[PDB]
Design a protein around this ligand. Structure first.
Ligand SMILES: COc1cccc2[nH]c(C(=O)N[C@@H](CC(C)C)C(=O)N[C@@H](C[C@@H]3CCNC3=O)C(=O)COP(=O)(O)O)cc12
Ligand SMILES: COc1cccc2[nH]c(C(=O)N[C@@H](CC(C)C)C(=O)N[C@@H](C[C@@H]3CCNC3=O)C(=O)COP(=O)(O)O)cc12
Lengths: 297, 298
């Protein structure tokens, strides 16, 4: 099932940042607070703000950073693409081991949704191929982060900025770079047309096999280039070499070649399910990575 | 609209590892007591059918090996409340939250924090099914994992994991050791009563889908409460009470759709199938969101 990482290490890092009357969420790691730069906007700013000129008018004493109602004093500020970095005078004693990472489409992560620096909920998300995520966010949620946990090291990968007219969501990595062609303006932006995450559909077929559901296994094989040409015709992502490599463990475990599996999914694409389920669903599931399959299992 | 768990940090600070001999599971460390399932004291040979009390009198405090991360806690006492072992230790959990022990009623949801060897591993949302099972995600060594709700800094523990049924649904107890359902902490194959679908939750979920723009299942018809329950019972859905009607008010006030209107919508879904369409991306009528879960998310 959809399963989030335990959130306690990220929870102890959430703070709020206020400019005038705009309060977003921030991420407090060591003695730096990271938040979306549009906190320095007010209403007339937003259509096309001048973050350069807006941040010139700013001084350290304009920034109210609070862990709860305890203020942390700002001693430096700077902009790095779309994230503001506020240097504070206290190193967060609950700073976990961590890295900032830029994820690829198809990869999953947990979102800690927060409001006023207060965690509200946790859930698993997948970065769609059009660099949106299908999240759950109200107003006040900007600055909420997404993350993975590997050996109690936290890999921060997403900071939330935007809800698109289609209800899906957009944001940056922790260096302030948007995933996708989105800009942090009060603007109706359009997502690229999404596609199905092929490497994840394959992982899910392996998990079916691991569990005894293998009727779909065929006797054929394919080249990777022939599958990628047939896959794009069904709005499926083409497979990279990195995709085949992370399918490796599930391949070895089931004994099924990655490219026989590809030839098996192709059949499911040309001929459908035939009123037959796979792991209980009538639809192919594309938001479990091979890591998520191995994670449990 | 996603299935959302409560932040698990408050529970993470409480999970520990409990080992007796060659069996290990998770315990819950609040104040100066560690709570764990009682079959941790069982040998392999014992687990088929053991006398738990005589198994416990023959126990020494020093045979219990409680590890909280890297520190070993010392057991200065023990007792047994139903299927839950209470291990008094010489150290109080300094990170003990405001908490309470609650017995959940069927249809209600909670967050499960899946743990292994006392280490948290995942968190997700479950519902107490009508037949007092939960459709969990649990492996070897998950026994002692807990379910809980948080309500303004207060944690309400409602479930401790014990068992996976042959059908692959799961069973356990409240934090006073009383099983949900007719299950026992024996190593035997146990079946549950026939399960049903949580009606008021499906309706909350239909209301969720309208709030997210999905409207294709709405219709102009309406129904009486009793004529809806006749059809719901026919399809193995729980009955709808007036109380359930009232709990749904906020969603019905919010969307402009009277509850008895959404029931006519659900009745037609039950009698006509979904014709290959989808609601909030699901091919199935989802019944593990309560009205409170929808309200708090939307
Ligand atoms: C013409 O305008 C539009 C037209 C059509 C679609 C549009 N979409 C946005 C947008 O999304 N705008 C960002 C801010 C940008 C301008 C930097 C925003 O509203 N983000 C929210 C999260 C959002 C709100 C609810 N659910 C979320 O995901 C926060 O993170 C806290 O913002 P608040 O200060 O608390 O209101 C503007 C817009
Ligand atoms: C003939 O026997 C059977 C036949 C058919 C079905 C059966 N089902 C069970 C059962 O579920 N038994 C509990 C222990 C009893 C004594 C209450 C258990 O087996 N295991 C887990 C949780 C489980 C592990 C797999 N998924 C979970 O949810 C623990 O965590 C504690 O024990 P372990 O640490 O694994 O040794 C026995 C059985």
């Amino acid at each position: 099932r959809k399963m989030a990482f335990p959130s306690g290490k990220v929870e102890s890092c959430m703070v709020q940042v206020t400019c005038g009357t705009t309060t977003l969420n921030g991420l407090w790691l060591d003695d730096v607070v990271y938040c979306p730069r549009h906190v320095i906007c007010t209403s007339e700013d937003m259509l096309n703000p001048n973050y350069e000129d807006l941040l010139i008018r700013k001084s350290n004493h304009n920034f109210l950073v609070q862990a709860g109602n305890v203020q942390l004093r700002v001693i430096g500020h700077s902009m790095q693409n779309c994230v503001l970095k506020l240097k504070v005078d206290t190193a967060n004693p609950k700073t976990p081991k961590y890295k900032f990472v830029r994820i690829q489409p198809g990869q999953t992560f947990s979102v800690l949704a927060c409001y006023n620096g207060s965690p509200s909920g946790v859930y698993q998300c997948a970065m769609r191929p059009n660099f949106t995520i299908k999240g759950s966010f109200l107003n006040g949620s900007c600055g909420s982060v997404g993350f993975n946990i590997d050996y109690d090291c936290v890999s921060f990968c997403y900071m939330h900025h935007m809800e698109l007219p289609t209800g899906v969501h957009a944001g940056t990595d922790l260096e302030g770079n948007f995933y996708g062609p989105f800009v942090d303006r009060q603007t109706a932006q359009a997502a690229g047309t999404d596609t199905t995450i092929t490497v994840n559909v394959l992982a899910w077929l392996y998990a079916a096999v691991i569990n005894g559901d293998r009727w779909f296994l065929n006797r054929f094989t394919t080249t990777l280039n022939d599958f990628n040409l047939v896959a794009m015709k069904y709005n499926y992502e083409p497979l990279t070499q990195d995709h085949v490599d992370i399918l490796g463990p599930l391949s070895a475990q089931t004994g099924i070649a990655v490219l026989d599996m590809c030839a098996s999914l192709k059949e499911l694409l040309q001929n459908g399910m035939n009123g037959r389920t796979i792991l209980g669903s009538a639809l192919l599931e594309d938001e479990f990575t091979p890591f998520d399959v191995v994670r449990q299992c």
